């Protein structure tokens, strides 16, 4: 699922500014 | 009546803007308690004002780290904009001061934590739950854009839930007062509008694309463009192809197809009717804009607070002894702070 992919991704934590 | 309110708000802003408040406190007037959050050149700490016993969130920035990251102008805009702004959905900056080493921004303690924390844990918000917050962001931007301010850092991490269950927008580090187009590549990868990535000049329309990313994220439980690495996120943003979760209402899909619009001549917020293309949209039909502004709408979630000094809604961060050099650091760069 798209949710599983998000959950398994490295970007489910607090995101930093660029 | 909205343009009347906004004209009063502008007059109030411009006076504080052209004549900013400086040195409104000292470090010894505050009792440092716990790190509420973190940033590249500082942290936000839960603080207690001794004279009053009031609780605040103090943002401490290291002057040298700000200079190293060439973030001088950014830090100056943030303090200048925050000390001049006044809206229900924006964190109130109570004080600001500086010492030999640091820049300080004493803000109102928003105890309910970040929307990020609740959204992650809960998974996704129900369309009315997201609409409620989206509405608050809509008016916030309407307010900021009238004052010619671009926010540039909208994300669940930056929106704090208050005791009444209303959003309080924090992190003004990318806020800029611009009458025209700007070019700085800044923001969070997931929320960047195609113009920012395409290194072309951009305006307020980037805040409307960000609002689009926020509404999708709130409603899906994931951003509309994610990948493990930022350049892979950028490839999805520039492509301008969004799949919507099967649970999204037709209204939401339509609102998002207009906000997450690569074409600026078609993007909601960036047209002749301006904000009203958003405000009047079918997805917002149930929204009473004035009631949202007055905080009279019932919050779908009121946070858990176990006293004035509670930090439970916020994650734990590692603490670091605040050292104040005996020599004034980067003094001239921050003279107007
Ligand atoms: O600490 C943060 C982001 S986390 C945060 N910002 N603001 C707050 C906050 C929390 C509660 N009440 C008001 C502000 N938390 C920093 C961002 C940039 C430099 S430090």
Coordinates of C-alpha atoms and ligand atoms in Angstrom, one line a residue:
Chain A
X1 CA 0.0 0.0 0.0
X2 CA 1.0 3.7 -0.3
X3 CA 0.8 3.8 3.6
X4 CA 3.1 0.8 4.1
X5 CA 5.7 2.4 1.7
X6 CA 5.5 5.7 3.7
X7 CA 5.8 3.7 7.0
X8 CA 8.8 1.7 5.7
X9 CA 10.3 4.9 4.3
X10 CA 13.1 7.0 5.9
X11 CA 10.9 10.1 5.8
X12 CA 8.3 9.3 8.6
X13 CA 10.2 11.3 11.1
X14 CA 10.4 15.1 11.7
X15 CA 11.5 16.6 8.4
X16 CA 14.2 19.2 8.2
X17 CA 14.3 22.4 6.2
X18 CA 16.5 22.7 3.1
Chain B
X1 CA -15.4 43.4 6.2
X2 CA -12.5 40.9 5.8
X3 CA -10.6 43.5 3.7
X4 CA -11.6 46.0 6.5
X5 CA -10.1 43.7 9.2
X6 CA -7.0 43.1 7.0
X7 CA -6.5 46.9 6.5
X8 CA -6.6 47.4 10.3
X9 CA -4.2 44.4 10.7
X10 CA -1.9 45.9 8.1
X11 CA -1.8 49.3 9.9
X12 CA -1.0 47.5 13.1
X13 CA 1.6 45.3 11.4
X14 CA 3.4 48.2 9.6
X15 CA 3.9 50.3 12.8
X16 CA 5.5 47.3 14.6
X17 CA 7.3 46.4 11.3
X18 CA 8.9 49.9 10.7
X19 CA 9.6 50.3 14.5
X20 CA 10.5 46.8 15.8
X21 CA 10.6 45.9 19.6
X22 CA 14.2 45.1 20.8
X23 CA 15.6 43.7 24.1
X24 CA 12.3 43.0 25.8
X25 CA 13.8 40.5 28.3
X26 CA 17.0 39.0 29.7
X27 CA 18.1 35.3 30.0
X28 CA 18.0 35.4 33.8
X29 CA 14.3 36.2 33.8
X30 CA 13.6 32.7 32.7
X31 CA 14.0 29.2 34.1
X32 CA 15.0 26.7 31.4
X33 CA 13.1 23.4 31.8
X34 CA 13.1 21.1 28.7
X35 CA 13.8 21.1 25.0
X36 CA 10.4 21.3 23.2
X37 CA 12.0 21.1 19.8
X38 CA 15.1 21.4 17.7
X39 CA 16.5 23.3 14.7
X40 CA 19.8 23.5 12.7
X41 CA 21.2 26.5 14.7
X42 CA 19.1 26.4 17.9
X43 CA 16.4 24.8 20.0
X44 CA 13.0 25.7 21.5
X45 CA 13.0 25.2 25.3
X46 CA 10.1 25.1 27.8
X47 CA 10.8 28.1 30.0
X48 CA 9.3 29.6 33.1
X49 CA 9.2 33.4 33.5
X50 CA 10.0 34.0 37.2
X51 CA 8.4 37.5 37.6
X52 CA 5.0 36.0 36.5
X53 CA 5.5 32.3 36.8
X54 CA 4.1 32.1 33.2
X55 CA 5.3 29.4 30.9
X56 CA 6.9 30.2 27.6
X57 CA 8.7 28.5 24.6
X58 CA 12.1 30.2 24.1
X59 CA 13.9 29.7 20.8
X60 CA 17.6 30.0 21.4
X61 CA 19.8 30.5 18.2
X62 CA 23.6 30.3 18.2
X63 CA 24.8 33.5 16.5
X64 CA 28.0 31.7 15.1
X65 CA 26.0 28.8 13.7
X66 CA 23.5 31.3 12.1
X67 CA 26.5 33.2 10.5
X68 CA 28.1 29.8 9.4
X69 CA 24.9 28.7 7.6
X70 CA 24.6 32.2 6.1
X71 CA 21.2 32.5 7.9
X72 CA 21.6 36.1 9.0
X73 CA 18.8 37.7 6.9
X74 CA 16.5 34.7 7.6
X75 CA 17.0 35.1 11.4
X76 CA 16.5 38.9 11.1
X77 CA 13.2 38.5 9.0
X78 CA 11.8 35.9 11.5
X79 CA 12.3 38.1 14.6
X80 CA 11.0 41.3 12.7
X81 CA 8.0 39.5 11.2
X82 CA 7.0 37.7 14.5
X83 CA 7.3 40.8 16.7
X84 CA 5.0 42.7 14.1
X85 CA 2.4 39.9 13.5
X86 CA -0.8 39.3 15.5
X87 CA -3.3 36.5 14.4
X88 CA -5.0 33.8 16.4
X89 CA -3.3 31.0 14.5
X90 CA 0.2 32.3 14.9
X91 CA 2.4 31.7 18.0
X92 CA 2.7 35.0 19.9
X93 CA 6.2 36.3 20.4
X94 CA 6.1 37.7 24.0
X95 CA 9.8 38.8 24.2
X96 CA 13.1 38.8 22.2
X97 CA 16.6 39.6 23.3
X98 CA 20.2 38.7 22.5
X99 CA 23.4 38.0 24.5
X100 CA 27.1 37.5 23.6
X101 CA 26.4 34.1 22.0
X102 CA 22.7 33.7 21.3
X103 CA 19.5 35.2 19.8
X104 CA 16.4 34.6 21.9
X105 CA 12.8 34.6 20.9
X106 CA 10.4 34.1 23.8
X107 CA 7.1 32.7 22.5
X108 CA 3.8 31.6 23.9
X109 CA 4.0 28.0 25.1
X110 CA 1.6 25.9 22.9
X111 CA 1.1 22.9 25.1
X112 CA -0.7 20.4 22.8
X113 CA 2.4 19.5 20.8
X114 CA 2.8 19.5 17.0
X115 CA 0.2 18.4 14.5
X116 CA 3.0 16.1 13.2
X117 CA 3.1 14.1 16.5
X118 CA -0.7 13.6 16.5
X119 CA -1.0 13.0 12.8
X120 CA 1.8 10.3 12.9
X121 CA 0.3 8.4 15.9
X122 CA -3.4 8.7 14.7
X123 CA -2.3 7.9 11.1
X124 CA -4.7 10.2 9.2
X125 CA -7.3 12.8 10.0
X126 CA -10.9 12.6 9.0
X127 CA -11.8 15.1 6.3
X128 CA -13.7 17.3 8.8
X129 CA -10.7 17.1 11.2
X130 CA -8.3 18.2 8.4
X131 CA -10.8 20.8 7.1
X132 CA -10.9 22.4 10.5
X133 CA -7.1 22.9 10.6
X134 CA -6.9 23.7 6.8
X135 CA -9.4 26.5 7.4
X136 CA -7.1 28.0 10.1
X137 CA -4.1 27.7 7.7
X138 CA -6.2 29.3 4.9
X139 CA -7.0 32.4 7.1
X140 CA -3.4 32.4 8.4
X141 CA -2.0 32.7 4.9
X142 CA -4.8 35.1 3.8
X143 CA -3.5 37.2 6.8
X144 CA 0.3 36.8 6.1
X145 CA -0.1 37.4 2.3
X146 CA -2.1 40.7 2.9
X147 CA 1.0 41.9 5.0
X148 CA 3.1 40.7 1.9
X149 CA 4.7 37.9 4.0
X150 CA 5.5 34.4 2.5
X151 CA 5.6 31.7 5.2
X152 CA 7.7 29.1 3.2
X153 CA 7.8 26.4 5.9
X154 CA 4.3 24.9 6.2
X155 CA 4.2 21.3 7.4
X156 CA 2.6 19.4 10.4
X157 CA 5.8 19.9 12.4
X158 CA 5.4 23.7 12.3
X159 CA 1.7 23.7 13.4
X160 CA 1.2 23.5 17.2
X161 CA -2.2 22.4 18.7
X162 CA -3.2 24.8 21.6
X163 CA -5.4 24.1 24.7
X164 CA -8.6 24.9 22.7
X165 CA -7.5 22.5 19.9
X166 CA -6.6 25.3 17.4
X167 CA -3.4 25.5 15.3
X168 CA -0.6 27.9 16.3
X169 CA 1.9 28.3 13.4
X170 CA 5.5 28.3 14.6
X171 CA 9.0 28.5 12.9
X172 CA 9.2 31.8 11.1
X173 CA 12.8 31.2 10.0
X174 CA 11.8 31.2 6.3
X175 CA 9.2 34.0 6.6
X176 CA 10.1 36.9 4.2
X177 CA 8.4 40.2 3.6
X178 CA 8.3 40.4 -0.2
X179 CA 6.3 42.6 -2.6
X180 CA 7.2 40.7 -5.7
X181 CA 9.1 37.6 -6.7
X182 CA 11.8 35.8 -4.6
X183 CA 14.3 33.1 -5.6
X184 CA 15.6 31.5 -2.4
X185 CA 15.6 27.7 -2.4
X186 CA 14.2 27.0 1.2
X187 CA 11.4 25.0 2.8
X188 CA 10.9 21.2 3.5
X189 CA 11.4 18.9 0.5
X190 CA 7.9 17.3 0.7
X191 CA 6.2 20.8 0.7
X192 CA 8.3 22.5 -2.0
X193 CA 6.3 24.0 -4.9
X194 CA 7.6 23.1 -8.4
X195 CA 8.8 26.8 -9.0
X196 CA 11.1 26.5 -5.9
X197 CA 12.7 23.3 -7.3
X198 CA 12.9 24.6 -10.8
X199 CA 15.1 27.4 -9.4
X200 CA 12.7 29.9 -10.9
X201 CA 11.4 33.0 -9.1
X202 CA 8.3 32.5 -7.0
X203 CA 5.7 34.3 -4.9
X204 CA 2.9 33.5 -2.3
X205 CA 1.5 30.8 -4.6
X206 CA 4.2 28.5 -3.0
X207 CA 2.3 28.7 0.4
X208 CA -0.9 27.6 -1.5
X209 CA 0.9 24.6 -3.0
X210 CA 2.2 23.9 0.6
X211 CA -1.4 24.1 1.9
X212 CA -2.2 21.5 -0.7
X213 CA 0.6 19.2 0.5
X214 CA -0.7 19.7 4.1
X215 CA -4.3 19.0 3.4
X216 CA -3.3 15.7 1.4
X217 CA -0.9 14.7 4.3
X218 CA -3.5 15.4 7.0
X219 CA -6.2 13.4 5.0
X220 CA -4.0 10.5 3.6
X221 CA -1.5 10.2 6.6
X222 CA 1.4 10.5 4.1
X223 CA 2.6 13.4 1.9
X224 CA 1.5 13.5 -1.8
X225 CA 5.2 13.2 -2.9
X226 CA 7.6 11.1 -0.8
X227 CA 10.7 9.1 -1.6
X228 CA 13.6 8.1 0.7
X229 CA 15.8 10.9 -0.6
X230 CA 15.0 14.6 -1.3
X231 CA 16.1 14.6 -5.0
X232 CA 13.7 11.7 -5.6
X233 CA 10.9 13.8 -3.8
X234 CA 11.7 16.7 -6.2
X235 CA 11.3 14.4 -9.3
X236 CA 7.7 13.6 -8.2
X237 CA 6.9 17.3 -7.4
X238 CA 8.1 18.6 -10.8
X239 CA 6.3 15.6 -12.6
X240 CA 3.0 17.0 -11.2
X241 CA 1.2 13.6 -11.0
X242 CA -0.7 12.9 -7.7
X243 CA -2.6 9.7 -6.9
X244 CA -5.3 10.2 -4.2
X245 CA -6.2 7.6 -1.5
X246 CA -9.5 5.9 -2.5
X247 CA -11.1 7.3 0.7
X248 CA -10.7 11.0 -0.5
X249 CA -14.0 12.7 -1.3
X250 CA -14.5 14.2 -4.8
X251 CA -14.4 17.7 -3.3
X252 CA -11.0 17.1 -1.6
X253 CA -9.5 15.6 -4.8
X254 CA -10.7 18.7 -6.7
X255 CA -9.5 21.1 -4.0
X256 CA -6.1 19.4 -4.1
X257 CA -5.9 19.2 -7.9
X258 CA -6.1 23.0 -7.8
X259 CA -3.8 23.7 -4.9
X260 CA -1.2 21.1 -6.1
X261 CA -1.3 22.8 -9.5
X262 CA 2.0 23.2 -11.3
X263 CA 0.4 25.9 -13.5
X264 CA 0.3 29.2 -11.6
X265 CA -2.4 30.7 -13.9
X266 CA -4.7 27.9 -12.7
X267 CA -3.5 27.5 -9.0
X268 CA -6.0 28.4 -6.3
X269 CA -4.8 31.4 -4.2
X270 CA -2.9 32.6 -7.4
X271 CA -6.0 33.8 -9.4
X272 CA -8.2 37.0 -9.6
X273 CA -10.6 35.9 -6.8
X274 CA -7.4 35.2 -4.8
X275 CA -8.2 33.4 -1.5
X276 CA -11.9 33.1 -2.3
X277 CA -11.3 30.4 -4.8
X278 CA -10.2 28.3 -1.7
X279 CA -12.7 29.7 0.9
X280 CA -15.8 29.0 -1.4
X281 CA -14.6 25.6 -2.7
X282 CA -17.2 22.7 -2.3
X283 CA -14.8 21.0 0.3
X284 CA -15.1 24.1 2.5
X285 CA -18.9 24.6 2.1
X286 CA -19.6 23.5 5.7
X287 CA -16.8 25.8 6.9
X288 CA -17.8 29.0 8.7
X289 CA -14.8 31.2 8.3
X290 CA -15.7 33.8 10.9
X291 CA -16.6 31.1 13.5
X292 CA -13.1 29.5 12.8
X293 CA -11.4 32.9 13.2
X294 CA -13.3 33.5 16.5
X295 CA -12.3 30.0 17.8
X296 CA -16.0 29.3 18.3
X297 CA -16.0 26.1 16.2
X298 CA -15.6 22.8 18.3
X299 CA -12.1 21.3 18.0
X300 CA -12.1 17.6 16.8
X301 CA -9.3 17.0 19.3
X302 CA -8.5 18.8 22.5
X303 CA -4.9 17.9 23.8
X304 CA -4.1 16.2 27.1
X305 CA -2.4 18.7 29.5
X306 CA -1.5 17.7 33.1
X307 CA -0.7 21.2 34.3
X308 CA 0.8 24.5 33.1
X309 CA 4.4 23.2 32.9
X310 CA 3.5 19.9 31.1
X311 CA 5.7 18.7 28.1
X312 CA 4.1 15.2 27.6
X313 CA 2.7 16.1 24.2
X314 CA 6.3 16.9 23.0
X315 CA 9.1 14.4 22.2
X316 CA 12.3 14.1 24.3
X317 CA 15.4 15.8 22.9
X318 CA 19.0 15.8 24.2
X319 CA 19.8 18.9 26.3
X320 CA 23.0 21.0 26.1
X321 CA 24.3 23.5 28.6
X322 CA 23.6 27.0 27.3
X323 CA 27.1 28.6 27.3
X324 CA 27.2 32.4 27.0
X325 CA 30.6 33.5 25.8
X326 CA 32.4 36.4 27.7
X327 CA 32.9 38.1 24.3
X328 CA 30.2 39.5 22.0
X329 CA 29.9 37.1 19.0
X330 CA 28.8 38.3 15.5
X331 CA 27.6 41.6 17.1
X332 CA 27.2 43.8 13.9
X333 CA 25.4 41.0 12.0
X334 CA 22.6 40.9 14.6
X335 CA 22.6 44.6 15.7
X336 CA 19.0 45.1 14.6
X337 CA 17.9 41.9 16.5
Ligands
LIG1 O1 12.9 24.3 18.0 C1 12.7 24.5 16.8 C2 11.5 24.0 16.1 S1 10.4 23.2 17.3 C3 9.4 24.5 17.9 N1 9.3 25.7 17.5 N2 8.5 26.3 18.2 C4 8.1 25.6 19.2 C5 7.1 25.9 20.1 C6 6.6 24.9 21.0 C7 5.6 25.3 21.9 N3 5.1 26.5 21.9 C8 5.6 27.5 21.1 C9 6.6 27.2 20.2 N4 8.6 24.4 19.0 C10 13.7 25.4 16.0 C11 13.5 25.8 14.7 C12 14.6 26.6 14.3 C13 15.5 26.8 15.3 S2 15.0 26.1 16.7

